[PDB]
From a paper:
The bacterial sliding clamp is referred to as the β clamp, whereas the eukaryotic and archaeal sliding clamp protein is called the proliferative cell nuclear antigen (PCNA). Hence, across every domain of life, the extraordinary efficacy of the replicative polymerase complex is dependent on their interaction with sliding clamps, which encircle DNA and greatly enhance their processivity. We have shown that PolD uses two distinct PIP-boxes for molecular recognition of PCNA, which are located in the C-terminal region of their DP2 subunit.
In the peripheral region of the complex, the DP2 KH domain, the DP1 OB domain, and some regions of the PCNA were found to be flexible and the local resolution map ranged between 4.0 and 6.0 Å. The structure of PCNA in the complex is not distorted compared with the structure of free PCNA and we conclude that the cryo-EM structure represents a stable interaction of DNA-bound PolD with a closed PCNA clamp.
Numbering used by the authors:
A (entry chain A), B (entry chain A), C (entry chain A): -1 to 116, 127 to 247
The structure:
């Protein structure tokens, strides 16, 4: 036997969206469940992007954890079960003595499923609205498979060049999209678009996205979960 | 020559939805047209489910039938024609002396198409909302190809078990989903999910669904058409 | 070097819709840019339909053209770039001394893309609402690959016949769909449905569509762009 737990989230469809949003690039993940909260850590199969989803105890209406354990489930089966959650439904994540996860969706009825279980020296920081960065990624995807990110003093540039076409998205603090731009020195880096597209899919104006990067080094993309939780991506630069 | 008729239905898109809803499992159907109403009878190609759609004269704004006949049309061509009907349009089903069905859609214009023509001893009864039974069927479809229906005194259970996963949907009269539960004895039966999915597709909260079943015997699923008409499915239990 | 220009359109998504609507049948097009406006001329690969899109200077918030030139771009890459334009965004079409088109989308940010650049004797006239003609084309597509257009004195008929099925859509000035019907003599002609479907895709009640045709001769289909511009199709009759 492993440690039992009962964890309740209000808004089953919103929770499915976090798990969907955090696991578009991955096939497997580890869930560290402690008294403080849940941590989901994963890497995509090409080991280019590290995912870290932190869900503290405070975002749950009920959080009964009297120990510590690391748990793995089939992520395809999990996403399919969570996709069954409706907008204002209650989500219950229960575990007993056995190696099984019990997932309840409370609404017009209670539907219970059972699943078997198993510091970078950054040069630039940018706080951007989620709709602007999702637009920019999509625009770059039309011309290339790589996207360049440039941070100058009070200016953030996104560019992509292909065999025939080019794209450029420039931003200053004057633009509605740029909330903050802290730059030590001129910073330029290029990243894969397949990875960026899955990180930015489903972002909007309500999303304050922090992007940290350096010269020829990884990008840290971060956005908050109800001002307590956090979804972080650490993305390797392109060769 | 066969007997002529003119039958008018108000709400062409709603009529297409009845025919779509009743014919998801079938490829051919017989339409018995009498002075009382229209009956559509069919069986799916595997002879596991019997469909019976009864549309009495009273749901039509015009019902001119001066005899009795059984008619068959290509169901694919019929569904495609009915799918052309808009929300508040008038549907006209006319037949003359010839073996042809004339289907008119009255709206921004009149669009006329011409088509060539050719007691179980139940132990349990359950009146359930259409949204709860559609949810339960979909949930079961994630883990298995068969679904078990259990009726106890004041409790209705839906369960499915696969190679790895399990699902359970429990209901009492306390639940908003359970309107009625009349049980003679404890009743358990299992049915194919492919069949159930097509029977419950498009059901919502406005739909009061009567499910009658017995131990190891067929299930009768029934829902009303404007409180006059009726769509009944008789589904064979799984081996 | 070729002549430079700057052309600004208010409503980027609406402009993408004109270019999408005008180029569903074509793969390449020539754009004649003069001081009066832009003309897009094209023919589909089977040379059955001629497209003529006229966009006068007056529909643009800025129209700086100090010469005359005929320009070609990859239409797939153009439609993909224009599809990035949002509802109330500003569209900027700029050209410098070089053989490149600069397309800017002004909104939550400025997103600049760079693209490399390269009298019939009619017998009948019909002014029809765009929703009625799109419905009629779709209805005919269910039974045949050809559609017959008939114009009598105060009556317009659309018919199609297949191997088994038939369709008929009749209209008089009494019908809401028929705004005008000017007929010299009884006019009958048949056209390919694949071509008609792309010409009528996206039309609604707000669209006053003029159809001019003759006996066994082409059809001219025309609709206005903000009461100034014009999209004309000249479609060859079917053999």
């Amino acid at each position: 036997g492993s440690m039992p737990f009962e964890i309740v989230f209000e808004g089953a469809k919103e929770f499915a969206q976090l798990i969907e949003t955090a696991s578009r690039l991955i096939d497997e993940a580890a869930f560290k469940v402690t008294e403080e909260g849940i941590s989901m850590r994963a890497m995509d199969p090409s080991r280019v992007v590290l995912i870290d989803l932190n869900l503290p105890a405070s975002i749950f209406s009920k959080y009964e954890v009297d120990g510590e354990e690391t748990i793995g489930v089939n992520m395809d089966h999990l996403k399919k079960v969570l996709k069954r959650g409706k907008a204002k439904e209650t989500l219950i994540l229960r575990k007993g003595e056995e190696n099984f996860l019990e997932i309840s969706l409370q609404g017009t009825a209670t539907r219970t499923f059972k699943l078997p279980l198993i510091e970078l020296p950054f040069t630039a920081k940018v706080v951007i609205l989620g709709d602007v960065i999702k637009e920019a990624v999509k625009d770059a995807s039309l011309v290339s498979d790589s996207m360049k990110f440039i941070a100058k003093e009070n200016e953030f540039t996104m560019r992509a060049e292909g065999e025939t076409q080019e794209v450029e998205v420039k931003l200053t603090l004057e633009d509605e999209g740029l909330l903050d731009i802290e730059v030590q020195e001129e910073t330029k880096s290029a990243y894969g678009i397949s990875y960026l597209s899955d990180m930015v899919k489903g972002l909007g104006k309500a999303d304050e996205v922090t992007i940290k990067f350096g010269n020829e080094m990884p990008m840290q993309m971060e956005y908050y979960i109800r001002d307590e939780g956090r979804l972080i991506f650490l993305l390797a630069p392109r060769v």
